[PDB]
């Protein structure tokens, strides 16, 4: 548990807000694991300093630098920058097992039981459910795996322009092999699904442990009324409201005195 | 194989067209199994006669009749009519194992290997992928199972108003148990997904064995140009076009001389 971690990634300040809320939500639900965040030089110094408070480890990744293992793949396929940066999660060999969570996820309950899982365990992606959604996955840091992923990234790219395509291509037995590597959908609950199959959300949505904010508007792009504790208009804003409650209650106060 | 069957359901003439195309597509791809269709008295006599040509067995279900086992459940929950009728698929104990396919599915390749599967095997539903989509499932006829399903239908209804909710509730270990009961998504490929995750469709859609026509427009509600062999406008109408090719080529000619 001391050598296990939740790992996220922020490549900018907007997603840094995501990561800060995510990390705060993990602390709120009393994870016994470490919290690590991949950051890039495009993340501002104050966001980085905030990340240093919320996270146990802030790891700077600069894929634009020739010294980075992924740099040559980035030059070949520059559009794969976010993915290549994310793949550095496999470089974190100080950890024996990690749960990667995208900075646009939100933890609603302790999910430390994810560390019982093996690489690669991920929840099904809605839309194409024989692919896993790469917003939340259990993996084992390994330079070997990292190199292998980089190699596939270089050779093939990713069928969807992101880490999800590449991770599915690499971890391609997921759909047909080992039900235990199917994380329950509630560990990576697509915010889109919270209305795409509304009866199912009503039936099973109360069990949500992780909400994954997808769609063209991320939580930080909403307006939140701190008096009514509600985002301003999707009659299930409960999750957005949790995100904003954490952001306004825990995250902003953390940054709010940086001017000092 | 002689006691195994594909089973579909038509509760009206529009879906009877679906069933006829479905059954024709199964014959086209050379199933060695029987073809059975549940029909209702709301299906016209000529549609029924067409079904008698395409299918090996046409089974009439009249849930509006007090003599039907499901009738009392129908009176209790009248909106569950389609589902209750569908559940009669479990009454077909002349078969040892069946693949149920909704009348809005379309077979693109032989799928007889589905009969290797056990009850309940179904593909994940996009949208809520810890539920299976009940458009295509492998099941074993059993009066006992039928009665148990009716009982749950009576007691609880269905969380989504259809067979899918009830079947998921009953076969609730699907998401967490036995990867072999996850049919590959290509055995029940949502027509909606054919654009909801477009990169995935491009990556894996060529493997489609069954297309499931979802959305507010069923294939028979489209206009098909027989000269250009294309439905008239979703830049993947290929599947609609297959459906219409079968309908215009095999199904309509079958009915076209009924006036005689
Ligand atoms: Cl398994």
Strands, E assignment, A72-183: 97-101, 105-107, 121-124, 132-139
Hey, CA dihedral for B174, B178, B179, B184, is it positive or negative?
Answer: negative
The CATH classification number of A1-260 equals 3.90.550.10
Q: Which residues of B33-52 are buried (b: 16+ CB within 10 A; e: fewer)?
A: bbbbbbbbebbeeebbebbe
State the Cα–Cα distance between residues A5 and A99, nearest whole angstrom. Answer: 6
Residue A164 annotated as part of some ligand binding site: yes
Quote the Cα angle for A57-A67-A80, to 5°: 80
Cβ-based neighbours of B157, under 8 Å, separated by 6 or more: B77, B80, B165, B166
By the CB criterion, residues less than 5 angstroms from ion ligand 1 are A 179; B 179
**Residue of B132, B200, B236 to mutate when probing chain A, most A C-beta within 10 A:** B200
CB-defined contacts A:B, below 8 A: 106
What is the signed CA dihedral for A128, A132, A135, A141, rounded to 10 degrees? -160
**Cα torsion at A75, A78, A81, A85 (round to 10°)?**
-10
- Scanning every residue of chain A, which has its alpha carbon at the shortest distance from the alpha carbon of B130? A185
Comparing alpha-carbon positions, the chain B residue that sits nearest to A183 is: B176
Closest CA to A83 of A157, A187, A189: A157
Q: How far apart are CA B102 and CA B124, in angstroms?
A: 15
Contact B129 A185 (CB under 8 A): yes
Tell me the two tokens of residue A216.
């063209």
Cβ burial B90-100 (10 Å sphere, 16+ → b, else e): bbbeebebbbb
Calculate how far, in angstroms, residue B46's C-alpha sits from the geometric centre of ligand 1: 47
Phi, psi of B171 (to 5 degrees): -90, 65
Angle ∠(B15,B19,B21) on CA atoms, nearest 5? 115
Closest of B256, B211, B3 to residue B103, by C-alpha: B211
- Distance (Å, whole) CA B68 – CA B87: 12
Tokens of B238: 């290929």
Tell me, letter by letter, the H, E, C secondary structure of chain B: CCCEEEEEEECCHHHHHHHHHHHHHHHHCCCCCEEEEEECCCCCHHHHHHHHHHCCEEEECCCCCCCCCCHHHHHHCHHHHHHHHHHHHHHCCCCCEEEEECCCEEECCCCHHHHHCCCCEEEECCCCCCCEEEEEEEECCCHHHHHHHHHHHHHHCCCCCCHHHHHHHHCCCHHHCCHHHECCHHHCEECCHHHHCHHHHHHHHHHCCEEECCCCCCHHHCCEECCCCEECCCCCCHHHHHHHHHHHHHHHHHHCCCCC
Q: Apex CA A122: angle with CA A119 and CA A123, to 5°?
A: 160
Cis omega (within 30 of 0) for bond into A105: no
- In chain A, the largest separation of any two C-alpha atoms, in whole Å, equals 55
In B, minimum Cα distance to A130 occurs at B185
Whether the Cβ atoms of residue B98 and residue B122 lie closer than 8 Å to each other: no
- Please choose, from the candidates B97, B184, B84, the residue with its C-alpha nearest in 3D space to the C-alpha of residue B141: B97
CA of B215 to the centre of ligand 1 (A): 32
B93 within 8 A of B64, measured Cβ to Cβ: no
Closest by alpha carbon to B196, among A190, A242, A232, A167?
A190
Nearest to A101 by CA among A136, A51, A133: A136
**Of A129, A176, A190, which to mutate for an interface test with B (greatest number of B Cβ within 10 Å)?**
A129
Residue A129: list chain B partners with CB under 8 A: 123-126, 129, 185
Within 8 A by CB and 6+ apart from A137, the residues are A99, A100, A120, A121, A122, A167, A183
Residue B162 has a CB neighbour count (10 Å cut-off) of: 16
For residue A146, say if its preceding peptide bond is cis, omega within 30 degrees of 0.
no
First-to-last C-alpha distance (Å) of chain B: 35
d(C-alpha B166, C-alpha B152), whole Å? 8
- Minimal Cβ distance to B175: which of A159, A184, A196: A184
- In chain B, residues with a C-beta closer than 8 Å to the C-beta of A159 are 199-200, 202-203
Method used to solve the structure = X-ray
CB neighbour list of residue A97: distance below 8 Å, 6 or more residues apart = A3, A4, A115, A119, A138, A139, A140, A141
Contact check, Cβ <8 Å, A160/B201: no
Q: Could you tell me where the beta strands, DSSP code E, fall in A1-96?
A: 4-10, 34-39, 57-60
B88: burial class by Cβ within 10 Å (0-12, 13-18, 19+)? Answer: buried
Which pair of tokens denotes residue A120? 């690669």
Measured CA to CA, the distance from residue B105 to residue A39 in angstroms comes to: 47
CB atoms within 10 A of CB B220: 19
Q: Which two tokens stand for residue B36?
A: 């059975």
Helix (H, G, I), strand (E, B) or coil at A108: coil
Domain ranges for chain B:
1-260
Resolution, in Å, please?
A: 2.0
A189-190 sheet: strands from edge to edge: A105-107, A210-212, A189-190
Q: How far apart are alpha carbons A169 and A120 in whole angstroms? A: 12
Residue A150 phi, psi (nearest 5): -60, -45
Residue B11 sits at φ, ψ, to 5 deg, of -105, -5
Q: Tell me whether residue A9 is exposed, middle or buried, using C-beta atoms within 10 angstroms of its C-beta: 0 to 12, 13 to 18, 19 or more.
A: buried
Which member of A127, A160, A184 has the closest CB to residue B126? Answer: A127
The span from the CA of B15 to the CA of B85, in Å, is 14
Q: Which helix (H) or strand (E) holds A145?
A: helix A143-156
Query: Hey, which residues does A57 pair with through a beta bridge?
Result: A36
């Amino acid at each position: 548990m001391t050598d296990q971690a939740f790992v996220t990634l922020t490549t900018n300040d907007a997603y840094a807000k995501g990561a800060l809320v995510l990390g705060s939500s993990l602390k709120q639900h009393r994870t016994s694991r470490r919290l690590a965040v991949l950051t890039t030089p495009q993340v501002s110094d104050t966001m980085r300093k905030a990340l240093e408070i919320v996270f146990d480890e802030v790891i700077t990744v600069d894929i634009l630098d020739s010294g980075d293992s992924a740099h040559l793949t980035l030059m070949k396929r520059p559009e794969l920058g976010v993915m290549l940066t994310k793949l550095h999660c496999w470089s974190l060999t100080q950890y024996s097992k990690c749960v990667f969570m995208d900075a646009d996820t939100l933890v609603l309950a302790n999910i430390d039981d994810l560390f019982e899982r093996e690489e690669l365990s991920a929840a099904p992606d809605p839309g194409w459910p024989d692919c896993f959604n790469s917003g939340v996955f259990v993996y084992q840091p390994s330079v070997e795996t990292y190199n292998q992923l980089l190699h596939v990234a270089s050779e093939q790219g990713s069928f969807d322009g992101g880490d999800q395509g590449l991770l599915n291509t690499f971890f391609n037995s997921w759909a047909t092999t080992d039900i235990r590597k199917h994380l329950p959908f509630i560990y990576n609950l697509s915010s889109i699904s919270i209305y795409s199959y509304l009866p199912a959300f009503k039936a099973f949505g109360a069990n949500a442990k992780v909400v994954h904010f997808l769609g063209q508007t991320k939580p930080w792009n909403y307006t939140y009324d701190t008096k009514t504790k509600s985002v301003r208009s999707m009659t299930h804003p409960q999750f957005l409201n949790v995100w904003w409650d954490i952001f306004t209650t825990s995250v902003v106060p953390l940054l709010q005195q940086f001017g000092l």
